[PDB]
Enzyme design. Structure first.
Site, short mmCIF file in Angstrom:
data_model
loop_
_atom_site.label_atom_id
_atom_site.label_comp_id
_atom_site.label_asym_id
_atom_site.label_seq_id
_atom_site.Cartn_x
_atom_site.Cartn_y
_atom_site.Cartn_z
N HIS A 1 127.23 16.94 40.43
CA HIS A 1 127.92 16.74 41.70
C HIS A 1 126.95 16.33 42.81
O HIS A 1 127.16 15.34 43.52
CB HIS A 1 128.68 17.99 42.11
N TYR B 1 136.37 17.97 48.27
CA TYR B 1 137.12 19.02 47.59
C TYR B 1 138.64 19.00 47.76
O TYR B 1 139.41 19.04 46.79
CB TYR B 1 136.45 20.40 47.68
N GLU C 1 126.53 24.00 45.64
CA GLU C 1 125.98 22.68 45.94
C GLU C 1 125.26 22.53 47.33
O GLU C 1 124.18 21.91 47.45
CB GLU C 1 127.19 21.78 45.81
#
Ligand code: HEM
Ligand code: HEM
Lengths: 135, 135
Positions: free
Chosen positions: A75, A85, A127
């Protein structure tokens, strides 16, 4: 999450899982179709199953961290952003709805909506940390 | 957890932090006094602040992962077991009530009870994952 939500989530995964191909299939056509700007970031077949799998451990999300973590690197490597998202979630819930049919009741969709959110927050936090640590 | 117990955690963390010092020392005296078997594994001053820190983020536990991750390694090196989790929580919650006094109403305790549990499992998962990964 509220128990009912958690309860519906645990109850429906199977039906969901039973309809993966379609969900997945409808999911990707719609994702690429309506959101041309992400097309560059990209096929990945296990999106829906990964979510379903996480949904299932919705009471112990830490359990999924090793996988959540293998995916994050990918990602981050592809420029995935917390803001992406929501459209993945929107397309997912739409496929879910499209495929449940009649069972796609209001409160069922809502609970899946809550679930993806929570699920998304794990990747979305990891992330962030990955990008933060990339220096 | 339930946004209620969550509401009590958030509300009281400040109170608990004010008395941090006392909770810490009462926690330790008692930990090592009541449970002699863990003394060999060992007085880290931040056990209490770390939990309070987490409880803060009880709505986004993934936020705490980088810290949780550095601690897990230490824990695994010291042979901490899921089975030990419960004694710690028993000893922390005891300090909590022994320190709050009459504010230490049962539901507060009960909320803190659930909170620690939730917090414990992230450590437990990560560690279980560290143990397993080793090889
Ligand atoms: C919880 C939501 C999400 C889940 C469960 C998830 C899941 C996955 C999985 C399982 C993979 C493949 C990893 C591998 O085995 O190599 C993947 C790859 C990928 N995901 Fe996601 N994803 C999520 C959200 C998103 C978002 C919001 C985006 C933004 C566009 C995104 C973009 C991608 C991209 C670009 C790839 C890499 C293609 C490749 O290089 O393999 N994901 N994702
Ligand atoms: C969520 C519950 C727990 C929290 C927040 C926690 C917190 C901490 C902290 C912050 C450290 C020090 C890390 C550092 O800065 O190097 C630590 C170390 C340690 N903890 Fe825990 N702990 C927890 C549960 C337990 C349990 C259940 C045991 C069982 C005995 C345990 C045993 C130890 C030991 C032996 C050390 C290492 C001392 C050292 O090598 O410095 N912990 N813990």
């Amino acid at each position: 999450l509220d128990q009912q939500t958690i309860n519906i989530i645990k109850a429906t995964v199977p039906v969901l899982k039973e309809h993966g191909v379609t969900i997945t299939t409808t999911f990707y056509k719609n994702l690429f179709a309506k959101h041309p700007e992400v097309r560059p970031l990209f096929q990945p077949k296990a999106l829906a199953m990964t979510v379903l799998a996480a949904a299932q451990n919705i009471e112990n999300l830490p359990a999924i961290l090793p996988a959540v973590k293998k995916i994050a690197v990918k990602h981050c490597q592809a420029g995935v952003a917390a803001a992406h998202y929501p459209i993945v979630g929107q397309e997912l819930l739409g496929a879910i709805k499209e495929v449940l049919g009649d069972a796609a009741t209001d409160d069922i969709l809502d609970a899946w909506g809550k679930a993806y959110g929570v699920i998304a927050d794990v990747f979305i936090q990891v992330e962030a940390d990955l990008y933060a640590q990339a220096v």
